């Protein structure tokens, strides 16, 4: 059982914090906010490093390149931006979506970016040029999450249409849809570290681990509240194998991956915890909360 | 095609209906049933046009859209006894008061 304890609260943003992500090298935390800013913080001391600005509206998500040198951000302004973290300089503005961009991620090789939008499309972008290479519009309602698998060969997307789709990156063609029964809106998805499974959240207060190839659900995690916001979830692998998610009751839940038992609830936030991230090497969680809170918290555990 | 009529004489108004294919004679038979005067003692009129017994109501210009339930057409009636023919005389209805200020 882990024993995460609060180490720091980070109160830079003036609005809802939308997303927190650790750099793959472990040094930095990036945060994004409805206040149009990205902030960079020291991962270990929570020390503010810089503000990155340029988006004309609220930011929904940020993601790191594999070498921790680049960020991409997804904005209500209908754009993504590629940034050089050292300079704070917008290298490229990705134009093409026709409504709010909600989610983004680089592939492992970090030559591509994938995005999803309220406009119901997934796009693949060239990082060097900033050109849209493909538009994948099969979803019939907003896209909530997009993720590359461990070698970049697949993308998974989640939608309010109630499907997850698996896409072949090279062709753009959809290989698989996961339609489970009732298909409540899907609010989050990503691939497991081993690439064989997908963790999906639905707005019926449920997280499921899916063997996507076989279309069968291995695990379900419940006890939290998730019926309105698109709350991120994580695999914690540095100590014990856990699933980490925020909750609309203002707590961070941590589940045993295998048993599905709630092992810990992190108390502290004063609004919905919309985002959580797990440090790549250390037992550290960052959580971020909505308008009545506007803070990031860093938590640390012995396992 | 049904037609809706007011048959009018003096200060009497009969509401009735008939078919566009109905004849003027059939209208007089309706009138006879109510007012107890046979058809030969009855003259029917559209405005000031005397109506022929053998014509249909449609042939006289009584149409489904000029003779509606909520807006019936007027037939004038005047009686006849032997060689004495009563003139067509239809007493008009009352009139409403001036429209109140708050309703303009």
């Amino acid at each position: 059982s882990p024993n995460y304890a609060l180490k720091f609260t980070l109160a830079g943003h003036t609005k809802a914090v939308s997303s927190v992500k650790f750099s793959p090298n472990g040094e930095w935390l990036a945060s994004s906010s409805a206040d149009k800013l990205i902030k960079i913080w020291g991962a270990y001391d929570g020390k503010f490093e810089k503000t990155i600005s340029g988006h004309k509206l609220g930011i929904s998500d940020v993601a790191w390149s594999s070498d921790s040198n680049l960020l991409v951000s997804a904005s209500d302004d209908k754009t993504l931006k590629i940034w050089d973290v050292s300079s704070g300089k917008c290298l490229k503005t990705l134009k093409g979506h026709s409504n709010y961009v909600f989610c983004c991620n680089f592939n492992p090789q970090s030559n591509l970016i994938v995005s999803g939008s309220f406009d119901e499309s997934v796009r693949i972008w060239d990082v060097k040029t900033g050109k849209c290479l493909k538009t994948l519009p099969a979803h019939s309602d907003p896209v909530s999450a997009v993720h590359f698998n461990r070698d970049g060969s697949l993308i998974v997307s989640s939608s309010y249409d109630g499907l997850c789709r698996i896409w072949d990156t090279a062709s753009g063609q959809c290989l698989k849809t996961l339609i489970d029964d009732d298909n409540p809106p899907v609010s989050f998805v990503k691939f497991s570290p081993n690439g064989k499974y997908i963790l999906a959240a639905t707005l019926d207060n449920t997280l499921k681990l899916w063997d996507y190839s076989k279309g069968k659900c291995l695990k379900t995690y419940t006890g939290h509240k998730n019926e309105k916001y698109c709350i991120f979830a994580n695999f914690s692998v540095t100590g014990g194998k856990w699933i980490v998610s925020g909750s609309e009751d203002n707590l961070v839940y941590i589940w045993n991956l295998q048993t599905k038992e709630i092992v810990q609830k992190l108390q502290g936030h004063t609004d919905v915890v919309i985002s959580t991230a797990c440090h790549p090497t250390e037992n550290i969680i960052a959580s971020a909360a909505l308008e009545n809170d506007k803070t990031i918290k860093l938590w640390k555990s012995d396992c | 095609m049904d037609v809706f009529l007011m048959i009018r004489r003096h200060k009497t108004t009969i509401f009735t209906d008939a078919k566009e294919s109905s004849t003027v004679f059939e209208l007089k038979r309706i009138v006879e049933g109510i007012l107890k005067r046979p058809p030969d003692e009855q003259r029917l009129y559209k405005d000031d046009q005397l109506l022929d017994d053998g014509k249909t109501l449609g042939e006289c210009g009584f149409t489904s859209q000029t003779a509606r339930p909520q807006a019936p057409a007027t037939v004038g009636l005047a009686f006849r006894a032997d060689d004495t023919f009563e003139a067509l005389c239809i007493e008009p209805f009352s009139s409403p008061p001036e429209l109140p200020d708050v309703m303009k």
Binding site: - | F4, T12, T13, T16, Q70, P96, L99
Partner: protein
Amino acid sequence: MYVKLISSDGHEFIVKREHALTSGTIKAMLSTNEVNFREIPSHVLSKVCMYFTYKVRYTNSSTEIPEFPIAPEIALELLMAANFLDC
């Protein structure tokens, strides 16, 4: 099957009994088959009779039903009559 309704100014309206029985007030008044209306003049009662025709014709119709038209000048006295007659 016909009844006579007489306005305050002495006009006589002869309408099918079924039509008149649209008004529950008139049904009570008939419990004679002539009725007098001390406070409804002919321009208003003529219009009431047109309503009865309209009502009986288009109730249970499944047709296009036209509007029952009411000029502003008569609306207030027709409201009062409709209220009295419960139709």
